[PDB]
Design a protein around this ligand. Structure first.
Ligand code: NA
Length: 231
């Protein structure tokens, strides 16, 4: 039985309507609506993808196609209602996503309610030298966050109320730094912070075990945001 995956390709956007689409995920990339590269990759690694967003006629057809409830975590809750076990979440704008990258996550992810793959600066500039990312210096290195999230639906189920809370402060740095704590903020803002420290506080906050997965495959996070990208 193929495990579930969820693609949050939902999201209306600006330039996307230039291509007369609306959602960035439906913008063509190398011949097909961008998100299909993601779907192809998911099935490829043996998963059944649930698709949240507009479906003009996506190929490969996703296992289920839920509509858009107007938000990254709102869509996630919707899709969760339709899955079981450990699920891999992904946004529909990382067209470079490969099966190898997906299986790594699956195979190397530690046993935790929540696992978030992160990529080292070192490898991000191995294929995509141009790509400009928001990094963070940790004692263990310099990374950026993926666009994938591995969840244990059942374990996570109980952290959603906080998830909602923390997600609501995605647009309020000061507010968000309240939750994280000042000390920590500076620590990493200086590189003075470490990976387990990050993980241990994340856990403190959510109540569930949360870990990061150093993932050598940068296609896990290099998304497409504008025209230059598509080329
Ligand atoms: Na204060």
């Amino acid at each position: 039985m193929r495990p579930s995956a969820i693609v949050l390709a939902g999201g209306k956007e600006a330039w996307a309507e230039r291509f007369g689409v609306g959602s960035k995920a439906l913008v063509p990339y190398r011949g097909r609506p961008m998100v299909e590269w993601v779907l192809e990759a998911l099935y490829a690694a043996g998963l059944s993808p649930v698709y949240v967003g507009e479906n003009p006629g996506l190929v490969p057809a996703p296992a289920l196609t839920l509509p858009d409830r107007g938000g990254l975590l709102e869509n996630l809750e919707q899709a969760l209602e339709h899955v079981e076990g450990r699920v891999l979440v992904a946004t529909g704008d990382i067209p470079h996503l490969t099966e190898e990258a997906v299986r790594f996550v699956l195979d190397k992810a530690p046993e935790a309610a929540l696992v978030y793959p992160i990529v080292p600066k070192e490898a991000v500039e191995a294929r995509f030298p141009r790509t400009k990312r928001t990094y963070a210096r940790l004692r263990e290195g310099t990374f950026t966050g993926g666009n994938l999230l591995l969840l244990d639906k059942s374990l996570f189920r109980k952290a959603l109320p906080l998830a909602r809370r923390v997600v609501a402060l995605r647009k309020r740095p000061l507010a968000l730094a309240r939750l994280v704590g000042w000390d920590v903020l500076l620590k990493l803002l200086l590189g003075r912070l470490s990976l387990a420290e990050v993980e241990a506080r994340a856990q403190r906050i959510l109540g569930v075990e949360a870990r990061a997965l150093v993932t050598p495959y940068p296609e896990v996070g290099v998304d497409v945001d504008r025209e230059e990208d598509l080329v």
